[PDB]
Design a protein around this motif. Sequence first.
Motif, mmCIF file in Angstrom:
data_model
loop_
_atom_site.group_PDB
_atom_site.id
_atom_site.type_symbol
_atom_site.label_atom_id
_atom_site.label_comp_id
_atom_site.label_asym_id
_atom_site.label_seq_id
_atom_site.Cartn_x
_atom_site.Cartn_y
_atom_site.Cartn_z
ATOM 1 N N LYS A 267 0.707 -1.227 -0.184
ATOM 2 C CA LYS A 267 0.354 0.051 0.341
ATOM 3 C C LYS A 267 0.911 1.219 0.190
ATOM 4 N N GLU A 268 1.616 1.107 -1.008
ATOM 5 C CA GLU A 268 2.387 2.187 -1.311
ATOM 6 C C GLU A 268 2.144 2.995 -2.962
ATOM 7 N N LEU A 269 1.496 1.896 -2.980
ATOM 8 C CA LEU A 269 0.149 2.222 -4.205
ATOM 9 C C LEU A 269 0.352 4.305 -4.050
ATOM 10 N N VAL A 270 -0.581 4.724 -3.051
ATOM 11 C CA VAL A 270 -0.723 5.612 -2.370
ATOM 12 C C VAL A 270 0.648 6.576 -2.502
ATOM 13 N N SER B 69 -4.170 -1.294 6.192
ATOM 14 C CA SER B 69 -4.977 -2.009 4.757
ATOM 15 C C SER B 69 -5.913 -0.135 4.045
ATOM 16 N N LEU B 70 -5.640 -0.157 2.926
ATOM 17 C CA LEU B 70 -6.791 1.067 1.995
ATOM 18 C C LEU B 70 -7.977 -0.169 2.734
ATOM 19 N N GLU C 10 -15.162 10.254 -0.654
ATOM 20 C CA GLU C 10 -14.342 11.388 -1.167
ATOM 21 C C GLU C 10 -13.684 11.325 -2.190
ATOM 22 N N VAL C 11 -12.458 10.640 -2.179
ATOM 23 C CA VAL C 11 -11.582 10.238 -3.482
ATOM 24 C C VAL C 11 -12.604 9.476 -4.401
ATOM 25 N N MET C 12 -14.036 9.713 -4.057
ATOM 26 C CA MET C 12 -14.515 8.641 -5.790
ATOM 27 C C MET C 12 -15.416 10.088 -6.309
ATOM 28 N N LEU D 188 -5.843 5.701 -12.863
ATOM 29 C CA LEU D 188 -5.909 6.210 -11.517
ATOM 30 C C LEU D 188 -7.258 5.669 -10.559
ATOM 31 N N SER D 189 -8.063 6.395 -11.021
ATOM 32 C CA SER D 189 -9.486 5.829 -10.989
ATOM 33 C C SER D 189 -9.441 3.970 -10.753
ATOM 34 N N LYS D 190 -8.808 3.275 -11.624
ATOM 35 C CA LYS D 190 -9.242 1.771 -11.909
ATOM 36 C C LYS D 190 -8.576 1.125 -10.991
ATOM 37 N N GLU D 191 -6.735 2.348 -11.022
ATOM 38 C CA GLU D 191 -5.820 1.056 -9.757
ATOM 39 C C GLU D 191 -6.400 1.312 -8.721
ATOM 40 N N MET D 192 -7.245 2.603 -8.061
ATOM 41 C CA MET D 192 -8.014 2.847 -6.946
ATOM 42 C C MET D 192 -9.040 2.327 -6.608
ATOM 43 N N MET D 193 -9.554 1.173 -7.829
ATOM 44 C CA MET D 193 -10.964 0.761 -6.544
ATOM 45 C C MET D 193 -10.455 -0.951 -7.293
ATOM 46 N N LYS D 194 -9.396 -1.583 -7.408
ATOM 47 C CA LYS D 194 -8.814 -2.534 -7.834
ATOM 48 C C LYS D 194 -8.386 -2.616 -6.007
#
Lengths: 142, 156
Positions: B9-12, B99-100, B105-107, B126-132
């Motif tokens: 979770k450095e995806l962040v 864990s995310l 809000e970020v939606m 990003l939108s996509k990556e974020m959902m997964k």
Amino acid sequence: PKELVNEWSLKIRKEMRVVDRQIRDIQREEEKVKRSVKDAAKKGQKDVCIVLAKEMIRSRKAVSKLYASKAHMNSVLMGMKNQLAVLRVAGSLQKSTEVMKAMQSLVKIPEIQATMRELSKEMMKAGIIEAEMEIDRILFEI
Amino acid sequence: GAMAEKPPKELVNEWSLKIRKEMRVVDRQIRDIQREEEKVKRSVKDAAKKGQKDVCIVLAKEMIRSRKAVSKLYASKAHMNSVLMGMKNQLAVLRVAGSLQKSTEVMKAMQSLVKIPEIQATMRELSKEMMKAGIIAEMEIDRILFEITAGALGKA
């Protein structure tokens, strides 16, 4: 002058320091609660855990709503930035839709709302809260 | 799944960098339009002074269109800033959980943000990556106790 902007920036920026502080405190609290939850679990106290856990959800939700606010405020600061421009250009303020709904979702945050109500008004009176004149208005740099 | 090899979770941090990048872009575009308003201004002046009514008129319609261009821009930047804070929040949530978790809000910022004029196809990615990831009454406590206690007071 028309440096109301610079004053409102400062206040907004002030309220954002508070929000930072609030969030820094809650998080420091979650630190501890998390340790409590660990001990309580080791000693098998199911009920202390469940309660504390709830404490945490409440924590997270609280912080979230804070960051929400920080964002709404930042939205306002930006609008403030833009105002300078709408001036540097012509020399009037423009009823921004942006700094209006942000300054609406902010007079609703718990604590801070007295100042925010007070700023909303000063703003409404400078005439940025609540064209064919603009096409004329703009022609004023002549 | 098995010996997977995901990013932690450095995806962040990654998304923060990109969002931050796009915001420099925005700053850039605002600056350029501003710079161009300066000129159009001088132009309007002369064209008034010389009695070219019809020219002022149009240079005006030019001026309004700039102003809205900058508005719509600062808008987007606010949105982006909202996503950035959301990421700070997610780090926060991770600092104690690891864990995310969702974010209405970020939606919406990342909904209003996937507009077209600009490379804003990345925003759809990003939108996509974020959902997964899992960012875009309860079992909250169970998941929580499980998070905090390393799967010892498990989930329901």
